[PDB]
């Protein structure tokens, strides 16, 4: 599959949880970005699709205070903006 | 699919990351147990299949200092021991 190139904030984010390359499959981008959200426990305790981005590297990348995981297009759109595909 | 009943240590472990039931599909047991490992960052930074269990609730449940994720049977065997299927 094609390799995508994370922009700096998202590269910093992926590396912060042990990714070690400049280019990645989308599938790996999604693995490490999930790992990161859980590693920092930014998910809501009771409604676990809600992610809190305020005052985190993620909110700097995404440009929102919070989002819902269920909004698939919205999440891909935010991710692609942080990638050179 | 069948619902399994976590034994107390593993129930404590699943609840510690927001699972809210006494019975669960295996698939959900595996989702929350993965979430937990990442939430506590017990995975090795450089070789990410290695999980450190020393001095954690997980090592009390599993009965090991460390394990490799790649040892599929071994991981299921440890999990079933912590479940009434």
């Amino acid at each position: 599959e094609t390799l995508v190139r994370p922009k700096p904030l998202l590269l910093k984010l992926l590396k912060s949880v042990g990714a070690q390359k400049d280019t990645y499959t989308m599938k790996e981008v999604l693995f490490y970005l999930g790992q990161y959200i859980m590693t920092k426990r930014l998910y809501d305790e009771k409604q676990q699709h809600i992610v809190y981005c305020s005052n985190d590297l993620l909110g700097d990348l995404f440009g929102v205070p919070s989002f819902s995981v269920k909004e698939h297009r919205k999440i891909y759109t935010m991710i692609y903006r942080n990638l050179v595909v | 699919e069948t619902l399994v009943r976590p034994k107390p240590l593993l129930l404590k472990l699943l609840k510690s990351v927001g699972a809210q039931k006494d019975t669960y599909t295996m698939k959900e047991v595996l989702f929350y147990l993965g979430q937990y490992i990442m939430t506590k960052r017990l995975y090795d930074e450089k070789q990410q299949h290695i999980v450190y269990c020393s001095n954690d609730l997980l090592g009390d449940l599993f009965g090991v200092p460390s394990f490799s994720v790649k040892e599929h049977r071994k991981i299921y065997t440890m999990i079933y021991r912590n479940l009434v299927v």
């Binding site: 599938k27 999930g34 699709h49 995981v69 | -």
Partner: peptide, 11 residues
């Protein structure tokens, strides 16, 4: 549903 599941559902 865990965050992990919801996440996995993106694919």
């Amino acid at each position: 549903t865990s965050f992990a599941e919801y996440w996995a559902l993106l694919s």
